[PDB]
Amino acid sequence: MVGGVV
Ligand SMILES: OC(C(F)(F)F)C(F)(F)F
Ligand SMILES: OC(C(F)(F)F)C(F)(F)F
């Protein structure tokens, strides 16, 4: 899994 960035 690759987490999102805000
Ligand atoms: O999981 C959240 C998302 F979806 F990427 F915005 C977080 F902001 F925490 F990264
Ligand atoms: O409101 C956004 C959230 F939801 F926190 F990701 C922002 F990144 F802009 F802060």
Centroid of ligand 2 to alpha carbon of 1 (angstroms): 21
Centroid of ligand 2 to alpha carbon of 5 (angstroms): 10
Q: How was this structure determined?
A: X-ray
Total number of residues shown for the chain: 6
Centroid of ligand 1 to alpha carbon of 2 (angstroms): 10
Q: Which residues line ligand 1 (CB under 6 A)?
A: 3-4, 6
Q: How far apart are CA 6 and CA 3, in angstroms?
A: 10
Tokens at 6, concatenated: 């805000």
| SS3 call for 1 | coil
Q: What is the resolution of this structure in A?
A: 1.1
Give, for ligand 1, the residue of 2, 5, 6 to mutate: max count of ligand atoms closer than 8 Å to Cβ: 6
